[PDB]
């Protein structure tokens with residue numbers, strides 16, 4: 110059974126892409142066959158895994174449009190994950206998708222052609238709530254929200270949760286919000302903890318554990334950040350294998 114995880118948050122700079130790549134690497138180390146999907150036209154994930162987006166002959170853009178088969182667009186990574194990459198062409202997608210029926214289901218249709226080739230698909234959503242993020246949420250079974258806890262600024266969480274609810278009502282009833290993954294956690298004071306407690310208090314959003322400390326990127330070594338990503342990846346594995354609920358930062 111292929112697990113599809115979307116990593117989404119319309120707020121920019123909260124470590125979505127670092128989280129996709131680092132969870133992907135951790136799961137690959139544990140033996141899972143991993144596909145990463147870059148849905149950001151700026152191509153941060155693609156660049157971070159060693160592919161110049163501007164030089165890709167095709168990308169996920171042609172795949173979403175149905176003009177190129179998904180397998181033909183896949184590229185390799187040094188750590189063994191497979192990548193469905195993106196480049197700036199993808200910014201034109203919604204102009205072309207809006208003119209077509211079922212624009213929300215383009216990525217879902219593409220992944221259906223790859224089912225059984227991968228144990229886990231992780232989708233890197235751009236900092237927006239438009240057609241590309243909707244495609245990510247519509248194709249996924251689970252979603253996590255990387256949530257920065259350097260500052261108290263979280264006015265966008267409400268609209269993000271509304272977006273999840275809308276997707277569950279219209280395009281993907283089975284989507285499960287696993288919760289928020291704390292990122293950019295600062296160990297110098299209790300401020301980051303207090304930020305996370307504030308979010309857990311005010312929003313119907315599980316805050317998951319462990320936080321990823323502040324040290325796009327790919328944390329795969331013996332650092333505290335890599336250690337935390339591997340611990341979180343283990344939690345995902347247990348949840349998918351035994352139904353174990355994801356551990357929470359605060360109950």
Ligand SMILES: Nc1ncnc2c1ncn2[C@@H]1O[C@H](COP(=O)(O)OP(=O)(O)NP(=O)(O)O)[C@@H](O)[C@H]1O
Nearest residue numbers: 121122123124125126127236322323324325326334
């Ligand atoms: N644990 C970390 N410690 C320090 N810097 C980090 C960490 N995680 C991410 N960063 C940096 O924070 C910045 C934003 O990370 P990134 O993974 O690109 O977030 P993002 O949510 O994908 N940005 P965007 O797609 O534009 O919304 C990058 O410069 C990363 O290298």
Ligand SMILES: [Mg+2]
Nearest residue numbers: 125126149153
């Ligand atoms: Mg990103």
